[PDB]
Amino acid sequence: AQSVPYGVSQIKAPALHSQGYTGSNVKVAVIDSGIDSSHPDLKVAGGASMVPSETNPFQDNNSHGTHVAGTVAALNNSIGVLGVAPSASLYAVKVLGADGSGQYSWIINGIEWAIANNMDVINMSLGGPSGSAALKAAVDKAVASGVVVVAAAGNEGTSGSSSTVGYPGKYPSVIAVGAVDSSNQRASFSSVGPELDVMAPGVSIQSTLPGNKYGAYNGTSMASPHVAGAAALILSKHPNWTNTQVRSSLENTTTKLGDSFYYGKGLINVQAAAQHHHHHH
């Protein structure tokens, strides 16, 4: 039997599934450590590796990209977990080495590959404390080209009145996502600041792991793909909506939580986002 992780229910993804919408024909790039394509609860449609010495994007020797991908798009069947957008076309864009680090140029090349291959959504469950002009230009180009770009806000927690949102989440063109638990409380590690945009579940999130396994992880890494998957659901229901419209629909229909410095606009609600008229609940 399949299980629906609590976070998929919490963002109201099952309301889209019941309407018949599951992210069909929507192309989502998981720009990350690869995706294990042999996992029976994932279907990987394509991809590419930007890591010079690790040329297979369908081998995930880290485990992180596979977990992120299952939250986006684990298959709807009788096994494992169910993803937010279980019919999405999933692309493994490997930009992190097995050791769990990537050069800025590799992430940029992955973003460029996504643009060149007409991805509808990019998820980046990744970050660093500094920007670069080249990084900002790549995310700005993707958004100018029509791609919905979603990233983890960072796991820096608080630091008085300072923003702790990392890059590329901190760029205006990217939707920066923080983490809440099942009671809608901000996780203590979740980055904060005026750049925090929306929140999604990121505590004890069950998903797919390499070698046909499953497991619960924590992080703004886990929160980001709920939002990338929600963007795919919305596009499958409204295939002409632009990235601008998909972004506004998620922002304009959150359930407001606390102060925006800690919670941004609150928890996404993809049921409300995917209606024509938007308001907060």
Binding site: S33, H67, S101, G102, Y104, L126, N155, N218, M222
Partner: protein, 64 residues
């Protein structure tokens, strides 16, 4: 619980490893170049050490 070590910035990666392992003997320590991008999972058992090209600590070490 001690979970950040701002006093280690500018020290050698060797001294940072020793000090972190005194405070947190079960820590999983990972050394990476400063200015790289890393995945955003939060692991209470892990301490990343970001080093400059001289192998000195270039960012406050913290659990995560």
């Amino acid at each position: 619980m001690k979970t950040e070590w701002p006093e280690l910035v500018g020290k050698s990666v060797e001294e940072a490893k020793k000090v972190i392992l005194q405070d947190k003997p079960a820590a999983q320590i990972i050394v990476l170049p400063v200015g790289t991008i890393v995945p955003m999972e939060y692991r209470i058992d892990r301490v990343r050490l970001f080093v400059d090209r001289l192998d000195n600590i270039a960012q406050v070490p913290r659990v995560g």
